[PDB]
Amino acid sequence: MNIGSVVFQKPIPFVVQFEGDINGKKFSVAGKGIGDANSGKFEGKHICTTGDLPISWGAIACLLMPCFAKYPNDVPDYIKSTFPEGFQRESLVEFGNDGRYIAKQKVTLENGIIYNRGTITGDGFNENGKIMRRELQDKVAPMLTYYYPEDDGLKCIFNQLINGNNEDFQEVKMSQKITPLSDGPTAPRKLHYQHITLDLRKDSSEAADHIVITENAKAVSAEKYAKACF
Ligand SMILES: [Cl-]
Ligand SMILES: [Cl-]
Ligand SMILES: [Cl-]
């Protein structure tokens, strides 16, 4: 029995706070939403409080809470087991023929609200590229992500494809490391996958530069994934 399973048994509001600096361009994002780990759906609206986001929203979409993923019982939920204290995650995000950035974030539970507080720092992006000129669509293709133990944390590796405006795609390569914020007991770290679909949309009434992320994440054991029907 893992304690985190009880806190996420009902939908929980969440708050996202990000500070960024990519190619010397500083930005700040503030968002809020709701996550339901019973369904694996969590949806939030995020606004760039410093003006316009210097990069395509899709490039930071899945950094703006894998604790909300729907985990079956035949998969040990390590991420939820780190609660109530929470977890931290470091990410190396590399874009094909463009730059890279590093993010560090801490996902905590405070007064019954999930807080995703993170920081992004990157450089080497093409100033005439579709990322920094924001010519990519706000559309991200479906994903499968790999989870597996490494050292004393849970490592996650996966790719992302952001649609371009001319039948092209932008490659996103991510390498993440999840570790607990406390030295308390956690669930087993075992190989498994997450099936994620993102839908980025805009609010007509919102004047600020923003994005509305509808995410549906489900965990799959390696035995059930191998026996999959599509
Ligand atoms: Cl941080
Ligand atoms: Cl870097
Ligand atoms: Cl570790």
Q: In terms of topology, how is this protein built?
A:
Blueprint: H1 4-7, E1 12-22, E2 25-36, E3 41-48, H2 78-81, E4 87-95, E5 100-110, E6 113-123, E7 136-140, E8 143-150, E9 153-164, E10 169-180, E11 192-201, E12 210-221, H3 222-226
Q: How would you spell out the order of helices and strands? A: HEEEHEEEEEEEEEH
CATH class: Mainly Beta
**Main β-sheet, in a few words?**
11 strands, mixed, barrel
The 3D shape can be described as globular
Strand tally, please?
12
What is the end-to-end distance? Answer: 32 Å
Structural class: mainly beta
Give the domain tally.
1
**SS strand fraction:** over 45%
PDB class: fluorescent protein
Keywords: red fluorescent protein, chromophore, fluorescent protein
Assembly: monomeric
Entry title: Structure of the weakly red fluorescent protein csiFP4 from Clytia simplex
Keywords:
monomer, 230 residues, mainly beta, Green Fluorescent Protein, eleven-stranded mixed β-barrel, 12 strands, 6% helix, 53% strand, binds chloride ion, fluorescent protein
